[PDB]
Swiss-Prot record, chains A, B:
Species this chain originates from: Homo sapiens (Human)
Domain of life: Eukaryota
Disease in which the protein is involved: Congenital disorder of glycosylation 1A: A form of congenital disorder of glycosylation, a multisystem disorder caused by a defect in glycoprotein biosynthesis and characterized by under-glycosylated serum glycoproteins. Congenital disorders of glycosylation result in a wide variety of clinical features, such as defects in the nervous system development, psychomotor retardation, dysmorphic features, hypotonia, coagulation disorders, and immunodeficiency.
Subcellular location: Cytoplasm
Protein name, UniProt field: Phosphomannomutase 2
Result after altering D184G: In CDG1A; severe
Family: Belongs to the eukaryotic PMM family.
Disulfide bonds: none
Keywords of this entry: Acetylation, Congenital disorder of glycosylation, Cytoplasm, Disease variant, Isomerase, Magnesium, Metal-binding
Gene that produces this protein: PMM2
Subunit record text: Homodimer.
Function field: Involved in the synthesis of the GDP-mannose and dolichol-phosphate-mannose required for a number of critical mannosyl transfer reactions.
Amino acid sequence: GPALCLFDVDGTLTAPRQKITKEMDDFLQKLRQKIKIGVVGGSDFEKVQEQLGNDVVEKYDYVFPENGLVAYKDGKLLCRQNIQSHLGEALIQDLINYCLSYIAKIKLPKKRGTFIEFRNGMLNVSPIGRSCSQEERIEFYELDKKENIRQKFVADLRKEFAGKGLTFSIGGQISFDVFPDGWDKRYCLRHVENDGYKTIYFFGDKTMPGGNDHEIFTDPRTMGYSVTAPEDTRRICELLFS
Amino acid sequence: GPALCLFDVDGTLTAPRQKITKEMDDFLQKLRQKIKIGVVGGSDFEKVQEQLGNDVVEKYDYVFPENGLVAYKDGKLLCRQNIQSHLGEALIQDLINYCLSYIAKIKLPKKRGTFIEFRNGMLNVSPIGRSCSQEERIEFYELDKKENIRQKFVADLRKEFAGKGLTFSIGGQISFDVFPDGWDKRYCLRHVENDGYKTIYFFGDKTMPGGNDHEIFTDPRTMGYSVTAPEDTRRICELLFS
Ligand SMILES: O=P([O-])(O)O[C@H]1O[C@H](COP(=O)(O)O)[C@@H](O)[C@H](O)[C@H]1O
Ligand SMILES: [Cl-]
Ligand SMILES: [Mg+2]
Ligand SMILES: [Mg+2]
Ligand SMILES: [Mg+2]
Ligand SMILES: [Mg+2]
Ligand code: NA
């Protein structure tokens, strides 16, 4: 029936760490006369504006920055959500308080700063601290492969907080992430599932496990299409919609 | 012998939270023809550049951002030291671990992120979290006037870490600073002392007990002069050097 084309932004409509090109922006604006188009990325609205232009809200039918925690539909803000409002201040504080108390008892070679990074969609907890040098990151990534610091911290947090709808995910070199269950790229589906689309195509490049596109690709509500670069996204869209 | 004029920036050359006037900026350059001049502030280099010009390192013979933990002389950066190297990783970790366990026990309306911010010449500690929004910032500032949160946290710290060579200072709205003893504005004199000068004048608008210009006004190496605004600094300098 009526369909929607949802795109990951980085890697799919744009080369990594690069702004959209005038040729792809035009391709999509022409594909917009055929089908309704929308974008989803984990970055704030200011980075989505640096990657797709400061007029993104008027050129895409849907804009879902921050995995859809911020949503725009037809030029207006549809919704706004953040981890503090969903989970409540009490539970937010109980999690921060356990994490600070826990990190204070970890015997590490070095401890720097920003042990807790409050993002609108998650909490990025660092035993060492995100403010550390790159040489200190590596020093902790190797000490963690031996003493399994992040694993034990996440396992004690899973035992104390996870019945409150919380997921814990070790990743990177120095931190793990604490987000409400389902606040990956899948969160954006709840603003398009009620708009009457018989099929919702989705295009992303990190569509294999451990990727930021994987969960939205594996969801039954999407017709997922893995991609490798923006030229490949224009290749598949020509084969699909003429 | 030769002399040097050290100036506070905010409130001494500039008005509160303002750029320098082109009148005062051109007066200081007519004084440089007759005496080497310098500037010193608590702000990062980029904030001193926004107040005095992007070419400050070439308009002034000495430029001492971060109270001198970052120091420029005749355009080139001078040897540098940081809070980790001076205090040691053990005291650092012991202060961080103590501050973290203390913050986990404060009952606040809201807690967010970046409770500890590792800077070159100090550790900034926010009971609420530095990442807090402007609304959450005012909220904690007004509560702390009533409950004296910052005040009690600094009193406990002065006790637990007595004799360890650390000073504590509540400034602003959401935080307090912890710096090595002597790392106030006096730190910068280590780069101008025994450099040929027989007199080192200083000018500051906050030279009273508890101000950021106090210890460098009362330090014996200096010839302190207390000012009220940019126009008063002009008056004293025209009295001394004209
Ligand atoms: O307000 P905050 O917590 O961001 O605090 C900010 O300002 C304070 C002084 O500010 P003022 O002299 O204007 O009172 C500084 O001590 C502090 O390091 C800085 O983070
Ligand atoms: Cl922190
Ligand atoms: Mg991508
Ligand atoms: Mg699917
Ligand atoms: Mg001042
Ligand atoms: Mg003096
Ligand atoms: Na800055």
